[PDB]
Amino acid sequence: PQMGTFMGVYLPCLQNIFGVILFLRLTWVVGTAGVLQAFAIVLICCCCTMLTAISMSAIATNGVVPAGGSYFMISRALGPEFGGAVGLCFYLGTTFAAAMYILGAIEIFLVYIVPRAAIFHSDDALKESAAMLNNMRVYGTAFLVLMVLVVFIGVRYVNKFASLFLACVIVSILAIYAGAIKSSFAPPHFPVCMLGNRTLSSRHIDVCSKTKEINNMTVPSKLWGFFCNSSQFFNATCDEYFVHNNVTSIQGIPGLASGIITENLWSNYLPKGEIIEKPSAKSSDVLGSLNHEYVLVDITTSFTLLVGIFFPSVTGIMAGSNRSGDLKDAQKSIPIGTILAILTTSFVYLSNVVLFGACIEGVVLRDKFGDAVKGNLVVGTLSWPSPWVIVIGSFFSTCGAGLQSLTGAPRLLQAIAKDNIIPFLRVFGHSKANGEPTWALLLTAAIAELGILIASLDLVAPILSMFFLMCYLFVNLACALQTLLRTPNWRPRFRYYHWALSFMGMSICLALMFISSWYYAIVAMVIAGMIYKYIEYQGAEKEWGDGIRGLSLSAARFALLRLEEGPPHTKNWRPQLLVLLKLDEDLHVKHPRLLTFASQLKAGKGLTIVGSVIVGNFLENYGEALAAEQTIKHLMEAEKVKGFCQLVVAAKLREGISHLIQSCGLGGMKHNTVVMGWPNGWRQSEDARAWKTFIGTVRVTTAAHLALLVAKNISFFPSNVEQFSEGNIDVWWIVHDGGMLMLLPFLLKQHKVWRKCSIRIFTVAQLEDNSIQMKKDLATFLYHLRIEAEVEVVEMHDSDISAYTYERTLMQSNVRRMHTAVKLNEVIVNKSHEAKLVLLNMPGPPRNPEGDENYMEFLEVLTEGLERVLLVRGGGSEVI
Amino acid sequence: PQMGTFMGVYLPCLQNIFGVILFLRLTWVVGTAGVLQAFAIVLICCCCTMLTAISMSAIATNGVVPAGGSYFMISRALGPEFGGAVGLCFYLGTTFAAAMYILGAIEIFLVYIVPRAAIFHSDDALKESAAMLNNMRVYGTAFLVLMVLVVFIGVRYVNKFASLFLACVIVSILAIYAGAIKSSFAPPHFPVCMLGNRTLSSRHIDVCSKTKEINNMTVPSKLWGFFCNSSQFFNATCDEYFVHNNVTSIQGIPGLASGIITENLWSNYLPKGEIIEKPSAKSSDVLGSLNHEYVLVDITTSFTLLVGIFFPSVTGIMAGSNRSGDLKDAQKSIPIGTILAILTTSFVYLSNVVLFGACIEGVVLRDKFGDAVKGNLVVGTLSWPSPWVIVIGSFFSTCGAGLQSLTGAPRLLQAIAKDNIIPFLRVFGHSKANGEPTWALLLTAAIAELGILIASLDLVAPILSMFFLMCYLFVNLACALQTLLRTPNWRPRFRYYHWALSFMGMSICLALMFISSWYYAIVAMVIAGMIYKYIEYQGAEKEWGDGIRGLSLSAARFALLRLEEGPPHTKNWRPQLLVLLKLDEDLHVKHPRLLTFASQLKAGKGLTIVGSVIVGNFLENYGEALAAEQTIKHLMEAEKVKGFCQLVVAAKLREGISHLIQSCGLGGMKHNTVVMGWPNGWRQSEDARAWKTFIGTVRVTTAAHLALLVAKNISFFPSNVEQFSEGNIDVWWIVHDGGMLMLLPFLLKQHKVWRKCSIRIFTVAQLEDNSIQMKKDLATFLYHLRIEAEVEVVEMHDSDISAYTYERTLMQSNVRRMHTAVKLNEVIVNKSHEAKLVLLNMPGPPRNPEGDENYMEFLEVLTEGLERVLLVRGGGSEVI
Ligand SMILES: *[C@@H]1O[C@H](CO)[C@@H](O)[C@H](O)[C@H]1NC(C)=O
Ligand SMILES: *[C@@H]1O[C@H](CO)[C@@H](O)[C@H](O)[C@H]1NC(C)=O
Ligand SMILES: *[C@@H]1O[C@H](CO)[C@@H](O)[C@H](O)[C@H]1NC(C)=O
Ligand SMILES: *[C@@H]1O[C@H](CO)[C@@H](O)[C@H](O)[C@H]1NC(C)=O
């Protein structure tokens, strides 16, 4: 239950990074690329996996850190959509890792431990490619089944013997560094033999000279047998290169004392079949083609090739947090414990590339399989007790790392199958009584089987470096997006984190990807995308019922929850129309001209809600309401309205109209303003209370602080077919109106019906001077990008607007308003009679209930027979 | 006003496809790639631009076809977001097209018309690269300014002389095909001179022989001067290749009579500097390095290179619909008129590649600049009247095509600047009184300037083929997506259209892209994406006010409008919770345990609405309602509810509860079911009407056909902290219940509080036998993937459920129900006393108003002291 950072998340991490590649291909990377370009591989590979440990640390700090495995930390903190992608690529990469580790174990056993037994002997000098490949196919499968049966049965022992496998590593890594300081001031004896700039394989021949001093008869040596025709007299019919050159035996370990970095420095990339030349020896250019017993370039090499080969040496960081459920401070361990394991595995890798180039001669650094040093490991030469310490040691370490890599594949595939997120793999979840599978173990054995039929570590490693790069990409991608877009419930409370650092790791992992193999690279990213979306589809067929419509519902809810963070009043104002249509008996809209006019503002634009009310007794007329809404649905689509319908069968009219103002639009998507018709047959029989319901709407919108745009003379409104040409539009400004009265004429002219019309700004002045006040307007037109308007000032008497300045200070006398209604309308018609639309301000209604006539006869004079006029007013807005 | 298909959309299309490439590089494509691989370029280029004409035809048929230019057809029918991308790439490609056409005009004038005048003479034998390049920089700019001033001033003439430019084409294309049939049975005289497999430039030398028969003294010829040391005696110190070989003069036009396709067939790709060898001649391998007067490979060639060079020969299909506003049947023209122009331009291109290989010798087909045929155009040899007909003709045609290509760039950039969609380029919109710019013409002159500083047709053409491929990609991409995703207002009423055909064109245009130049390819697609999104951002800062929040609002509305197409009842059922909380004075929630329980079903899941009502007089207590909703907001987030709030200050309680059931959730996002508390202190003082408001909710949900889940004993509900372990959960089945009663226990166990609990299915049987009825259940558990439940049947008497079968047939006696309430509850407690939750069915309420007690004392007995029980009922659902 109680673990620590050291033995909890550091040692299982450091177990799963040091492995075969430090022993089996590292010096070959050192010798081929030189010091400098092999120095360039490791820093582009270590910093590829440092940045992922940072992005995983932000997953570590943020969240709850669920107990058990790293995958649940990856799944719960990024949504299950990425857990399908990152959880699956790390599966496939781990299955090859068990195959690559077991392939390295056969390679060292068949070369170094037992070179003698080989079931597929080379039948000729060039069968060595096929003979070695056909070894690795028929051998590792014989040891693959052994591995699977002991992870199926002896799973108790392998949990116990994990300390020895790390112990096999730790004694094997020191012995390099111990024997390294020994060769300084005391190099051991490992002679190599040379002939010309090229050299020769020293396997069978013991002593190298052109002759052989036998006690009384100096014979030509075995080299004469391996270069001339036969083993015979010292005579002709020999080579042209062996004759004109001489046999040289030099030291392959010149120690740290020599200057080697300055000479063994440059790139040595060669095509396949090239004989391993030394850059400093004497040679006679006689050009023999004599390839019997030599040393060659085994496969063709390049710089981009060695990156895809070296890269599985650094992998295994997701195994650093496999024991999260046993920790005590997991939000503090997983950043600290893992990155410090990265810093100690980069320190080893950068050291030995220097330490190999400064102590071992570069010609045997190109030598694969230790062929010039008589089947000794090139690392093992630098081992102070014995090479057998490393050879038996590095055999066990890649054995146990393969023993480790089978536990995870079987375990992980249950965790996705128990997650039930893909129904294709529901069958894999059937575990035993103790958490071991029989189907995931069948899948892991079958996928790792294909790597043995590849039968070469230098072709498995580029494929294996692909899948781990697919995970390390989508870890950095998902950490960057949720930090940039601010996906809800994502708070990375980590010190050393920034969003662009995962973005920089997102680019490098993509740069590593195409450079390896491009037609593998595209098919990797495309098969990743369609499995990603197939998660997102099957979220809908579980949660929102079924179908493809739920994905739009899910994306709707995922958007609507986002606006609940901030305030809706941050910067700007736009009208979002709630219109409401009165319905008589045999229910039809009383005035569709609003629904024309509403679309004559926000055509193909924002939130539009149509309002509607039916009176009395919801309990039976519901099917009528199902029928009445369809009338509007085929009426909104007729007049190009892309909006939403709301129909309520309330009891009383005053109740429904109050409700739809305060209860339309869920959540952050709210309507912003109300557009309403007019009680037209006003001074009539019974509708005086219905007139007061029109008054009752006004005091609602003041209390709800929502703008109101009520139309007058509604039948005389232009349809959506006809157009207008050359009619003026007037606003009538008061300083408390706001930028609606500026913005609303601008929104009108964008529609084609109100296109060819002129704008006459007829402002009402209450102050004295106009020139600064007209400058105040012309400043706004330079600000509001709508300088097409033309201004004109009027002012008569500030007592004639005592109906308005009484409200402005609040920002008989009611009879004193009614004389001033007539006097102001005389001004309006005399400058704007033939107006195709008028914009008038709607004043503040009285707080008194018997200010009903005191407000409305004042307004019916204020509509002194005008053609088209909107009475507007709004509250608390900003237009920038 | 009235145009036709022929002279309207066909001839302006056919004008803008035939151009320079048929005359200046086509034969060089024929000679280099052979017949077969040059045959492969044209079919991957013609079918690249056929499929775009189909996808443009679906834009042509669907929609209104606005008058004026192709861009408005592209913009209005795909949203303005793609019109930023497709409208801009077609601008940049057109600017280079004016530069590439004018560069070809200088090339033919400086080689073929006037070879004599050249301001930058070659100072040595290898200055020919730099001298020719420095010609094209200093010449075309002198003719660039001439082109700009006449499109600025003489724009009236160039509208008139467009018929002559097509007339320059049509007489020039026939003269190939006229002179082609002439060389069959009557080839003209165009001799070529050969020496070995290689050959020589025939510019200066007239007659070729190793000597020169002067009337009485046969001198060694000029070739002796161009191969040996000097012009001297017939002696030594000569070449080793000219001496051992001989001068051969053969025919370069062997006509259609010879078998040439069978011999001139294979690929002739050579590196730069290679001497043009004939594959069939006699040669002496003496290896001179004598490169004075020869013929060479001018630039290095490859198959992927010639595709990016040939491709601007097929471009110009967006100019096929530039005159849409003058048509009469534009929805029928633009499919028919354009594709038939594609069929007649593919017919020419495929013919001449055959006709060149079957009539002209392949060695002069590799010959650029007509150097072996004494500065004659290789096409012009096949011209029956004169080569000067083609040479003057193809000069004028690429002149007028360059004269055309300046009108569009200036015109198009206004149309985007008048669209105001990018504020960075608002300044470009300032036209003159007649639609000509001064800033777009400044931008078009400056962008085309850079191509002249490239000064080579074979480097401009790969860059020019990039931008036109960027448009032809995003045309096919946008046509495929809106057809697959079904974006609203997208109905392609075209015959010969399918969605995958634009998808196949989407792949090929992307295949053409990376193969040209990959590091140009990525930077093209990335600078396309961020300009695309920058349109989508600035839609929000104009429409939804401002900010980045409007993009989520816009994506919300774009999703909510989509569900208005189909029915919500297509396949499946899921609960979408509307919960409602009663609020007393000093307003707090009476029972938060619902809000625990609601999240104990849909945790991190779908639509959740909380319901709430305040009584009386909205006109002043609005700030309280602003305060009361914040109580719930910090209460829903406390109990892990990601849902939405609705608060109404209504008058009476019955009015508000009826309203929020029928008016919550805008549009397609509707709540599906109601969860409600219980009138707990039931038989008490005043709340009998408040009890009937609880009854009043029941008859609402029947009429609205929405499911109801009312909880009993609400204080005895487990919180979200505690857990449960080993308690049974019972449902109680009636055949008219529905799969809710099956699905609801399954939804409970997924939460961790209801995790470790058992499921006992206690069904109520009304029939006789149970074995088939239990088989009917076990069939459902095999169907519903939830076989963890365990069943048990009861049946006593069907008269004891006369309270239910009276309702089932509808799918004293009220007192006769009340005796049967006691008898059924005896069954419930005797098998399910220690139940941590009970699921009971809620029966149908009476239609009579005085069935108030007749329904509820029957139910209060039905909750005979049980711990936790939900009374559920729902109507008209499907669970699959
Ligand atoms: C090769 O080595 C021999 C020593 O046996 C020496 O005599 C001879 O000069 C050498 N040849 C060279 C250095 O070319
Ligand atoms: C060895 O010598 C040959 C000629 O003797 C030379 O051309 C070759 O480059 C040399 N090899 C090296 C320097 O690796
Ligand atoms: C080259 O041509 C001459 C004709 O002047 C002929 O005599 C000679 O044999 C030819 N050489 C060949 C075909 O190798
Ligand atoms: C011409 O002849 C040389 C040798 O005489 C030959 O190697 C070369 O391939 C020939 N050129 C061709 C066939 O194009």
Nearest to B353 by CA among B21, B107, B111: B21
**Cβ(B364)–Cβ(B260) below 8 Å:** no
Burial-class residue B572 by CB neighbours within 10 Å (0-12, 13-18, 19+). Answer: middle
Distance A210 CA to ligand 1 centre (A): 11
Count of Cβ atoms closer than 10 Å to residue B755 Cβ: 12
| Single-letter code of the amino acid located at B88 | L
Nearest Cα residue in chain A from B573: A545
d(CA A803, CA A393): 99
Cα separations (Å) of A215 from A208, A219, B721?
16, 10, 94
d(CA A853, CA A840): 19
Distance B216 CA to ligand 3 centre (A): 24
| DSSP state, residue A120 | S
Nearest to B543 by CA among A876, A575, A742, A748: A575
Of residues B573, B607, B622, nearest to A557 (C-beta): B607
B197 lines ligand 4 (CB under 6 A): yes
| DSSP state, residue B425 | G
| B546 contacts on A by Cβ (under 8 Å) | 570-572, 880
A683 lines ligand 1 (CB under 6 A): no
**Cβ(B493)–Cβ(B460) below 8 Å:** no
Cα separations (Å) of B313 from B100, B109, B316, B822?
11, 20, 9, 92
Cα separations (Å) of A761 from A758, A787, A792, A836, B877?
10, 11, 6, 14, 59
DSSP string, B51-74: HHHHHHHHHHHSS---SSSSHHHH
d(CA A315, CA A294): 36
| Single-letter code of the amino acid located at A147 | M
CB contact under 8 A, B546 and A571: yes
- Beta-strand (E) ranges in B741-830? 756-764, 790-794
**Cβ(B650)–Cβ(B685) below 8 Å:** no
| Single-letter code of the amino acid located at B695 | I
| Single-letter code of the amino acid located at A811 | M
A282 lines ligand 1 (CB under 6 A): yes
Distance from CA of B549 to the nearest CA of A (A): 7
Token readout for B396 is 């004028």
CB contact under 8 A, B559 and A561: no
Of residues A561, A650, A662, nearest to B642 (C-beta): A561
Q: Where are the alpha helices (DSSP H) in B109-263?
A: 128-152, 155-160, 162-183, 222-227, 241-244
| A541 contacts on B by Cβ (under 8 Å) | 572
| DSSP state, residue B9 | I
Cα separations (Å) of A240 from A246, A316, A441, A508?
12, 53, 59, 52
| B664 contacts on A by Cβ (under 8 Å) | 663, 666
Token readout for B428 is 């470009």
Cα separations (Å) of B174 from A621, B31, B171, B179?
78, 22, 5, 8
d(CA A457, CA A469): 18
d(CA A667, CA A663): 10
Return the residue in B646, B666, B669 with the most chain A beta carbons within 10 A, the one to mutate for interface testing.
Answer: B666
Token readout for A284 is 């006679």
Helix axes B688-703, B653-662, angle to 10 degrees: 20
For residue A576, what are the β-bridge partners? none
Nearest to A32 by CA among A306, A342, A285, A315: A306
**Cβ(B867)–Cβ(B714) below 8 Å:** no
Nearest to B693 by CA among B600, B613, B782: B613
DSSP string, A486-555: T-SS-----TT--HHHHHHHHHHHHHHHHHH-HHHHHHHHHHHHHHHHHHHHHHHHHHSSSSSHHHHHHH
d(CA A625, CA B663): 12
Helices (H) and strands (E) in chain A — how many of each?
Answer: 30, 14
Token readout for B27 is 């034969």
**Cβ(A90)–Cβ(A468) below 8 Å:** yes
Cα separations (Å) of A786 from A287, A783, B435?
86, 8, 22
Of residues A555, A563, A663, nearest to B559 (C-beta): A555
Name the strand (E) or helix (H) holding A8.
none
CB contact under 8 A, B703 and A619: yes
Angle at CA A466, nearest 5°, toward A463 and A468? 120
| B551 contacts on A by Cβ (under 8 Å) | none
Handedness of CA B156, B162, B163, B165 (dihedral sign): positive
Nearest Cα residue in chain B from A750: B419
Count of Cβ atoms closer than 10 Å to residue A586 Cβ: 5
Nearest to A70 by CA among A337, A266, A438: A337
Q: Buried b vs exposed e over B112-126: b needs ≥16 C-beta within 10 Å?
A: beeeeeeebeeeeee
Name the strand (E) or helix (H) holding B389.
helix B387-417
Nearest to B341 by CA among B88, B7, B24: B7
Angle at CA A416, nearest 5°, toward A412 and A419? 140
d(CA B65, CA B56): 12
Q: Specify the pairing of strand B211-212 against strand B608-615.
A: unpaired
The four Cα atoms B611, B614, B617, B623 give a dihedral, to 10 degrees, of -90
Contacts of A420 (CB under 8 A, 6+ apart): A426
Helix axes A36-61, A499-516, angle to 10 degrees: 130
| B537 contacts on A by Cβ (under 8 Å) | none
Distance from CA of B660 to the nearest CA of A (A): 9
Distance from CA of A92 to the nearest CA of B (A): 28
Distance from CA of A573 to the nearest CA of B (A): 5
Nearest to B88 by CA among B77, B79, B75: B75
| A548 contacts on B by Cβ (under 8 Å) | none
d(CA A630, CA A610): 12
| DSSP state, residue A790 | E
Contacts of B62 (CB under 8 A, 6+ apart): B77, B490, B491, B492, B493, B494
d(CA A35, CA A266): 7
d(CA B880, CA B877): 10
Q: Where are the alpha helices (DSSP H) in A62-161?
A: 71-76, 80-108, 128-152, 155-160
Q: What is the resolution of this structure in A?
A: 3.6
d(CA A140, CA A138): 6
Contacts of B549 (CB under 8 A, 6+ apart): A562, A563, A566, A570, B540
Of residues B570, B619, B663, nearest to A699 (C-beta): B619
**Cβ(B660)–Cβ(B578) below 8 Å:** yes
| DSSP state, residue A382 | G
B283 lines ligand 4 (CB under 6 A): yes
d(CA B461, CA B448): 13
At B413, give phi and psi (nearest 5°): -75, -25
CB contact under 8 A, A546 and B649: no
Nearest to A317 by CA among A7, A75, A49: A49
Name the strand (E) or helix (H) holding A265.
none
d(CA A828, CA A826): 6
At A140, give phi and psi (nearest 5°): -70, -30
Residue whose CB lies within 8 A of the most ligand 3 atoms, among B245, B246, B249, for a mutation test: B246
Distance B246 CA to ligand 3 centre (A): 6
Contacts of A221 (CB under 8 A, 6+ apart): A205, A207, A208, A209, A210, A211, A212
| Single-letter code of the amino acid located at A668 | G
User: Helix, strand, or coil here: A729?
Assistant: strand
Helix axes A518-543, A499-516, angle to 10 degrees: 130
Contacts of B247 (CB under 8 A, 6+ apart): B193, B194, B195, B208, B209, B210, B223
CB contact under 8 A, B559 and A553: yes
Q: Buried b vs exposed e over A431-457: b needs ≥16 C-beta within 10 Å?
A: beeeebbebbbebbbebbeebbebbeb
Of residues A544, A571, A658, nearest to B618 (C-beta): A658
> Which residue's CA is the closest to the ligand 1 atom numbered 4?
A246
The residue written with tokens 């068990």 in the block is A98
Contacts of A341 (CB under 8 A, 6+ apart): A10, A13, A14, A17, A320
| Single-letter code of the amino acid located at A444 | T
User: Helix, strand, or coil here: A239?
Assistant: coil
**Cβ(B791)–Cβ(B758) below 8 Å:** no
Query: Which ligand is in closest contact with the Cα of B208?
Result: 3
What residues of A are designated binding site?
261-262, 264-266, 421
A141 lines ligand 2 (CB under 6 A): no
Cα separations (Å) of A414 from A124, A152, A417, A444, A780?
49, 15, 5, 12, 66
**Cβ(B306)–Cβ(B269) below 8 Å:** no
Q: Specify the pairing of strand B577-580 against strand A211-212.
A: unpaired
Nearest to A509 by CA among A544, A463, A456, A472: A472
Q: Buried b vs exposed e over B677-700: b needs ≥16 C-beta within 10 Å?
A: bbbeeeeeeeeeebbebbbbbbbb
For residue B589, what are the β-bridge partners? B583
CB contact under 8 A, A646 and B663: yes
Count of Cβ atoms closer than 10 Å to residue A164 Cβ: 12
| DSSP state, residue A123 | S
At A249, give phi and psi (nearest 5°): -120, 120
Count of Cβ atoms closer than 10 Å to residue A415 Cβ: 18
CB contact under 8 A, B545 and A663: no
Query: In this complex, how many residue pairs, one in chain A and one in chain B, have their CB atoms less than 8 Å apart?
Result: 141
At A756, give phi and psi (nearest 5°): -85, 70
B218 lines ligand 3 (CB under 6 A): no
Q: Where are the alpha helices (DSSP H) in B600-753?
A: 622-636, 653-662, 688-703, 740-749
